[PDB]
Amino acid sequence: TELTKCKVSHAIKDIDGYQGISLLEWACVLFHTSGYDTQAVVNDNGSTEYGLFQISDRFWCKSSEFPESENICGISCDKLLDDELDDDIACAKKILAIKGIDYWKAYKPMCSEKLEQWRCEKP
Amino acid sequence: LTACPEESPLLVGPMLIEFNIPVDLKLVEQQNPKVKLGGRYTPMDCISPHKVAIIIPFRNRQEHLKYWLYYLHPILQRQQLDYGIYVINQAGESMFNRAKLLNVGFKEALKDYDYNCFVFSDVDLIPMNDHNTYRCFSQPRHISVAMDKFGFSLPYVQYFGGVSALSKQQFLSINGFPNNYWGWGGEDDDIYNRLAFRGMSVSRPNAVIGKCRMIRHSRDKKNEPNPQRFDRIAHTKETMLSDGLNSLTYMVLEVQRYPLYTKITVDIGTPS
Numbered sequence: 309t310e311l312t313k314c315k316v317s318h319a320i321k322d323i324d325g326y327q328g329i330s331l332l333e334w335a336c337v338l339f340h341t342s343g344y345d346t347q348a349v350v351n352d353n354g355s356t357e358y359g360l361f362q363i364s365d366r367f368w369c370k371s372s373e374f375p376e377s378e379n380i381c382g383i384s385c386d387k388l389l390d391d392e393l394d395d396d397i398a399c400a401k402k403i404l405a406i407k408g409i410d411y412w413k414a415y416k417p418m419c420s421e422k423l424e425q426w427r428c429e430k431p
Numbered sequence: 432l433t434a435c436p437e438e439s440p441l442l443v444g445p446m447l448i449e450f451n452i453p454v455d456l457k458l459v460e461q462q463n464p465k466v467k468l469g470g471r472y473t474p475m476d477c478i479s480p481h482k483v484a485i486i487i488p489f490r491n492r493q494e495h496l497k498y499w500l501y502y503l504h505p506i507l508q509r510q511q512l513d514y515g516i517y518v519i520n521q522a523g524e525s526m527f528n529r530a531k532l533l534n535v536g537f538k539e540a541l542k543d544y545d546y547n548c549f550v551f552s553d554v555d556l557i558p559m560n561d562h563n564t565y566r567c568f569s570q571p572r573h574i575s576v577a578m579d580k581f582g583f584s585l586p587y588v589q590y591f592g593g594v595s596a597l598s599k600q601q602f603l604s605i606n607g608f609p610n611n612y613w614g615w616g617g618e619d620d621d622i623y624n625r626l627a628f629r630g631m632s633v634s635r636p637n638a639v640i641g642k643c644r645m646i647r648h649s650r651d652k653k654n655e656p657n658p659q660r661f662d663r664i665a666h667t668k669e670t671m672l673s674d675g676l677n678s679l680t681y682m683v684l685e686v687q688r689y690p691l692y693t694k695i696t697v698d699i700g701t702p703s
């Protein structure tokens with residue numbers, strides 16, 4: 309499903325401030341990462357990135373095309389292609405604590421200024 | 432003859448834009464008798480200060496083009512513009528390179544007429560209000576401000592994708608657009624970066640006047656998300672001086688003059 313900035317913002321509220329990244333920065337990051345599409349599937353040289361957070365099967369989740377992945381998140385990548393974000397979030401948090409925000413290449417170029425526009429004002 | 436009014440008296444405002452009733456280019460020509468070979472039109476009633484080349488990046492979307500032509504020709508004439516339509520067809524099967532095709536459109540159009548304004552438009556966007564003039568302004572102009580694809584809203588303030596217009600001078604100022612973005616994404620953010628570095632701001636009509644409708648389509652295997660897009664965008668400041676109009680190379684495989692447009696098929700090379 310292609311979510312709205314506000315659907316996304318409400319759904320990932322739990323990640324706010326984690327590792328020092330605000331919800332505004334995330335709303336920005338997720339838009340350029342997946343267009344807020346919970347079913348986004350992208351190829352990246354031999355690897356595949358899944359869902360809203362574009363979590364890669366290279367190290368983070370277990371896919372059928374790469375069953376020997378380290379699967380640091382301990383989750384099947386297909387679980388990252390649905391509308392239930394709790395597990396996506398738990399995985400994103402491990403990526404943030406282990407690798408850091410720079411896993412998301414859009415952060416620096418697209419979300420270093422003009423963050424206010426990313427605020428969701430919808431209760 | 433006298434100069435055309437700052438605003439055309441022909442404008443209709445909001446329009447119903449639909450993609451059902453198949454269109455017949457022959458009919459479109461029938462309905463647009465003032466448009467001359469190659470898709471050129473110049474007002475007979477007044478003199479327009481807007482000499483606009485409308486550049487459309489393209490690859491196997493003839494069905495989208497028919498609707499684009501069907502809707503835009505009447506709109507552009509209403510807007511009283513001295514314009515020409517150029518479809519830049521990317522030959523081959525490499526990943527789509529939108530920005531480079533747009534650079535080709537600029538150079539090629541200039542061979543035909545002394546245009547002073549260039550409108551860059553994807554084939555699948557149709558404006559819903561003819562007050563959204565397809566011409567150039569004192570600052571770079573972002574035209575497709577409120578597309579349905581984004582819930583009739585601007586997705587982010589730095590967005591300069593879809594349809595835009597740059598005066599010849601604004602284009603030259605940023606050394607044109609990048610040639611090194613293959614596949615989907617980022618090239619329009621790079622352009623936005625170039626404009627900002629040359630000290631320009633983006634001019635836009637409001638979200639009501641700027642509504643546009645997008646003709647839907649399925650993922651394009653020839654235009655998969657570009658993995659390097661983010662690094663490229665992050666370095667525009669340095670690469671804009673070496674990648675753009677000044678470094679553009681391509682081979683024209685055919686120039687086609689149809690009654691409703693000029694289609695230039697080109698070989699723009701491959702990723703390197």
Ligand SMILES: OC[C@H]1O[C@@H](O)[C@H](O)[C@@H](O)[C@@H]1O
Nearest residue numbers: 339340592616617618619620
């Ligand atoms: O689709 C909207 C815009 O989204 C961005 O994240 C991409 O980098 C742009 O190329 C695209 O035009």
Ligand SMILES: [Ca+2]
Nearest residue numbers: 387388392393
């Ligand atoms: Ca999930």
